[PDB]
Design a protein around this ligand. Structure first.
Ligand SMILES: COC(=O)C[C@H](CCc1ccc(C(=N)N)cc1)c1cccc(C(=N)N)c1
Length: 223
């Protein structure tokens, strides 16, 4: 997260870190046994880490649970990043409390101008590199699809939205991938892609979760 603030330990209780020996992507706990992330975060040997603040220090609230299966969206295209979404089932159900809670799926899509909270442990610089140990947060509005398409000619599909600031300076980044965009108490987006980070006229592009709610509900009902 470039240009954000320190969340505060366990203030974003649905945030997960995906670990394969190290943090490589974020994710969102949507129920006691399922996490949503970006399909571009797929790999084997994922351990889901819940209840994290400092991902390098065991501080007491963590639950480390291995994934039993992962399901990449049937129509995911890695070249265009269309349908960039994936479900991960936990080997055991998490224990849900105040510090570890699920986030609700949307009943409807969010409108341009809606304020959102994006979080993750990704890079905090646009040109340089510096990875935080603790969780970073950013409030950012959903942009109009017109401005989104103007910024990224020929690249924005119906399964994508932009959020952030056209002036730059504030954005998600590498390492934040797969993580939550929560608006109005609902998971509306997944950190997906962008040109660089926090560059002028290049906002963050996010998987449009409201388009996938049926697929998500149907998949977890049979798996
Ligand atoms: C699918 O992945 C991507 O699009 C990658 C890309 C980051 C590439 C990058 C890597 C390192 C650095 C740096 N060290 N300063 C900067 C940019 C990316 C990933 C997630 C969000 C955003 C976003 N703009 N919201 C951008």
């Amino acid at each position: 997260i470039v240009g954000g603030y320190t969340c505060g330990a366990n203030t974003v209780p649905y945030q997960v870190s995906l670990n394969s020996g190290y943090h490589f992507c974020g994710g969102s706990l949507i129920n006691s046994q399922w996490v949503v992330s970006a399909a571009h975060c797929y790999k084997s040997g994922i351990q889901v880490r819940l209840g994290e603040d400092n991902i390098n220090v065991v501080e007491g609230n963590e639950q480390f649970i291995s994934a039993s299966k992962s399901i990449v969206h049937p129509s995911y295209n890695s070249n265009t990043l269309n349908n960039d979404i994936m479900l991960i089932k936990l080997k055991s159900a998490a224990s849900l409390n105040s510090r570890v809670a699920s986030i609700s799926l949307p009943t409807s899509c969010a409108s341009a101008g809606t304020q959102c909270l994006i979080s993750g442990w990704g890079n905090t610089k646009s040109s340089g590199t510096s990875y935080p140990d603790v969780l970073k947060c950013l409030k950012a509005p959903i942009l109009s699809d017109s401005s989104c398409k103007s910024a990224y000619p020929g690249q924005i599909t119906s399964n994508m939205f932009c959020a952030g600031y056209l002036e730059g300076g504030k954005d998600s980044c590498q390492g934040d991938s797969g993580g939550p965009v929560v608006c109005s108490g609902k998971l509306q987006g997944i950190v997906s892609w962008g040109s660089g980070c926090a560059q002028k006229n290049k906002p963050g592009v996010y998987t449009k979760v409201c388009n996938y709610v049926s697929w998500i509900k149907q998949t977890i009902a049979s798996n």
